[PDB]
Design an enzyme around this catalytic site. Structure first.
Site, PDB file in Angstrom:
ATOM      1  N   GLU A   1      38.272  65.762  24.943  1.00 23.09           N
ATOM      2  CA  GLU A   1      36.972  65.166  25.161  1.00 23.09           C
ATOM      3  C   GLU A   1      37.143  63.975  26.086  1.00 23.09           C
ATOM      4  O   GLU A   1      38.054  63.179  25.905  1.00 23.09           O
ATOM      5  CB  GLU A   1      36.338  64.503  23.939  1.00 23.09           C
TER       6      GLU A   1
ATOM      7  N   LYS B   1      30.629  68.406  24.251  1.00 23.41           N
ATOM      8  CA  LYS B   1      32.016  68.121  24.594  1.00 23.41           C
ATOM      9  C   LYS B   1      32.948  68.565  23.474  1.00 23.41           C
ATOM     10  O   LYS B   1      34.034  69.083  23.742  1.00 23.41           O
ATOM     11  CB  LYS B   1      32.300  66.635  24.832  1.00 23.41           C
ATOM     12  N   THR B   2      32.536  68.331  22.223  1.00 25.82           N
ATOM     13  CA  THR B   2      33.435  68.535  21.093  1.00 25.82           C
ATOM     14  C   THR B   2      33.622  70.028  20.860  1.00 25.82           C
ATOM     15  O   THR B   2      34.754  70.487  20.734  1.00 25.82           O
ATOM     16  CB  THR B   2      32.927  67.852  19.821  1.00 25.82           C
TER      17      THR B   2
END
Ligand SMILES: Cn1nc(Nc2nc(N[C@@H]3c4ccccc4C[C@@H]3O)nc3[nH]ncc23)cc1C(C)(C)C
Ligand SMILES: Cn1nc(Nc2nc(N[C@H]3c4ccccc4C[C@@H]3O)nc3[nH]ncc23)cc1C(C)(C)C
Lengths: 452, 454
Positions: free
Chosen positions: A155, A114-115
């Site tokens: 995110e 996600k990051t």
């Protein structure tokens, strides 16, 4: 309007000031209190916030709504005053989620990636002159006043209470992994999240993930799949690695093949790039911006960061660094090493973070940590916690050793890793520094150490 | 997404959704077995209509909406699935509409329907013409205008619907949270989560006379206005007086003078409905004159505790009440509303159970709730296409109740004539309640026009 004045209690807190900044941009009146003046309060003042130092009931006078950090107590006189007069008190994380109602929201969800994907999207959008506000770890960034762009990339963490209240225009799901935590409830959570999309919004789904593939039929929104899978709508082919750089060709519907590189190795980063390309393509970003954004992307610090090479007798050892300190994150890092470099022996340095976490997730640590070929277990990073008997690095060593496969090497927080580890290393090894606490220091030191 | 295709577009809840989507500027197609005025109306608003079902009717649809009556074997649905076109259930698409308008969602166990309709009535009196949704059916005032035209969309919000937690209202009402005659913690959380779908600048309208609403009040981190008879309610009814079918009361609101209103429906439940409506109309900036007119000229909703008037018997009359509720919890609320409003009046209830499955599943609850009547006429089950289930019918219920020694039910069949059955039983001052769906809907209209009660 109904609500004009928003009051932040603890406005100098790490993720509070960003929210205040974007609310000012949206044209709300913003006040905030803090125990301490700082550059953060100074900055907010120049953007037109009214700042109070100290907490007293009257700082909340005329507030239509309060936003509180996790550091604020309910007996805080400003909170107490708001409650007594029936003013809504909203947690920081909830207000953060609310921001997407005002912007073109791109929510990046899934267990892993996600990051980096959020950061990659931001990078590619920047290359196309878009300057999005983006959110990583509850912190808002842009490159200017936060919130200026029509784009908000964030995110989306499935364990946050505001996850199912996000209202994105576009949602990514990188994968759904339930290991080392029902699985059925997790799937349903993601299905429900995707149904927060408008019927005309877009779901960007990694079909290489078995669980994503499985829930595809339940989505009922416009969907674009990505992956190496032959049936993916957006596909990477002709993947080749050249040192730190990965080249591949991306196939997209009604487009000519597009050759790209990314300056960070591993199949996981091809997948990150693919998700980004789906989103940039759907947004109408040029091939040139996509190529530049991906090509000049450095990486996220301590997210599977390859630090390079340590010299030993007969060749070298690839050094990898990652801050993950939950079993599920560690297992994914190890799987990424086994997939990308299946022949290379894995030497892992791991430090557990917190005794409580070690206690709570103990059996999962035993299992995941046991996947290394060689294991150096560092003494727990307490983070202010008192020791818990039977839930520390010495116990983990014993738990793993008992299983007959691996014999961990224990070491203390003040020991010097380089002389400890060098005699163990062989040419062709991968050395992984895994964890937070004292671990962050290690890879920088190893790379500049005489012994290597 | 440009083109939305409805399978079964002539359905009662389908046509309204299609009409609103046309209004929003989507291309809309739909198929149906039969042409009708419904399909004709949709055509005038720009829908492409197909008669009959064949796979190719769905060609070029970006999304499908499927009627509740229609399954995966329909060739149009099957075709959309085979080609990975999104298929959305009707109820889901209905919920989506609120994203495009100023949504007013009316939730809670009891009073959702009447309150929805009252809000619409008061808004109409103030020259707004909101689209409103009752029982999945979309309506507006004056069939000239196109559904969805108003910036306002008022709708019942049912907590058992899968799309409840996907509603995006600007204003949400909670009339009450009642778990009776049916996990209680999960129910509360559902309502809390629904309220948190409001934006931080939206409005929650909460009935604090309800214990469970009051209990969850502190978890609502949204602007809230409470209503009720409760002394601590933000909006309060006082000086309540009843004049036949008409209730008068004064409403106290913050920063306003007391406001005298009447509503042409008896019972405290309708004061509460009115209060919720007044909160919403006031917050929307509707005049006191419109509020007074809207409330005053409000008739009611068909078969929602509808008072049909009076049956004449020896020595006076019988108040005839009609209600479609066919779950124990709905029936218990109706009976409680009668005991509260008219505590002296003997309750004669005609009840028909709907479905054998429901009778089986909720059997003991029926025995208990139906036993609250002073006199009970149990009609033979309405099957609704179901096969009989032994031990789960009206005859069994009669025995279950009769054995308890308190009440002796009077059984009758679906084809029997109620009026001659019931008249000899009735006494002046009775309340006659016709309760249920199925064959029950027919009863009260017949009774009121029958010679025996003329
Ligand atoms: C038409 N209609 N409309 C209602 N509306 C509300 N009913 C109540 N409660 C109730 C009440 C009140 C007094 C006596 C008995 C009962 C029983 C129930 O508990 N609370 C409310 N808050 N806001 C609105 C509202 C309720 C009903 C019935 C009659 C169909 C059940
Ligand atoms: C930085 N970062 N970025 C990731 N991104 C994605 N990882 C995966 N999954 C898997 C994968 C893929 C290749 C090798 C190993 C593994 C194991 C992992 O589970 N799937 C994806 N879909 N879209 C993006 C994405 C993952 C990571 C790690 C290295 C921190 C876990």
């Amino acid at each position: 309007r109904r609500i004009r004045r928003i009051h932040f209690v603890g406005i100098g807190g790490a993720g509070m000031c960003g929210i205040a900044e974007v609310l000012l941009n949206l044209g709300y009146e913003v006040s905030g209190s803090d125990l301490k003046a700082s550059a953060v309060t100074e900055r907010l003042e120049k953007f037109g916030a009214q700042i109070f130092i100290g907490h007293q009931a009257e700082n909340a006078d005329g507030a239509d709504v309060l936003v509180v950090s996790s550091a604020i107590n309910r007996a805080n006189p400003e909170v107490a005053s708001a409650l007594e007069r029936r003013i809504p008190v909203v947690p920081r994380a909830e207000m953060l989620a609310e921001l997407m109602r005002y912007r073109h929201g791109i929510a990046v969800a899934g267990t892993h990636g996600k990051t980096t994907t959020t950061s990659l999207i931001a990078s590619v959008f920047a290359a196309g002159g878009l300057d999005p506000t983006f959110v990583i770890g509850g912190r808002l960034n842009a490159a200017a006043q936060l919130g200026a762009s029509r784009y908000l990339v964030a995110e989306a963490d499935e364990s946050d209470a505001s996850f199912l209240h996000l209202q994105p225009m576009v949602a990514v799901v990188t994968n759904i992994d339930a290991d080392h935590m029902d699985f059925n409830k997790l799937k349903k959570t993601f299905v429900e999240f995707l149904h927060n999309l408008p019927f005309y919004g877009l779901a960007v789904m990694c079909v290489d993930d078995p669980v994503v593939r499985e829930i595809l039929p339940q989505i009922a929104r416009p969907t674009v799949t990505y992956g190496l899978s032959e049936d993916a709508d957006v596909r990477a082919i002709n993947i080749r690695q050249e040192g730190m750089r990965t080249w591949f060709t991306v196939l997209r519907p009604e487009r000519e093949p597009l050759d790209v590189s990314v300056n960070m190795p591993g199949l996981h980063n091809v997948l990150n790039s693919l998700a980004t390309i789906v989103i940039a393509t759907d947004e109408g970003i040029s091939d040139e911006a996509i190529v530049q954004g991906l090509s000049g992307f450095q990486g996220v610090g301590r997210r599977f960061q390859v630090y390079g090479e340590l010299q030993v007798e007969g060749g070298s050892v690839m050094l990898v660094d990652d801050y993950g300190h939950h079993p599920r994150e560690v297992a994914a890092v190890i799987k990424a090493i086994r997939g990308g470099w299946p022949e290379r022996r894995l030497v892992m340095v791991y430090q557990p973070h917190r005794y409580t976490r070690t206690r709570d997730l103990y059996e999962d640590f035993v299992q995941v940590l046991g996947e290394a070929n060689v294991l150096l277990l560092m003494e727990v990073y307490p983070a202010g916690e008192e020791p818990i008997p039977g839930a520390d690095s010495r116990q983990l060593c014993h738990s793993i050793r008992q299983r007959g496969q691996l014999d961990p090497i224990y070491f203390e927080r003040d020991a010097d890793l380089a002389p400890l580890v060098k005699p163990l290393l062989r040419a062709g090894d991968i050395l992984l520094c895994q964890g937070a606490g004292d671990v962050g220091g290690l890879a920088p030191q190893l790379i500049k150490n005489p012994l290597f």
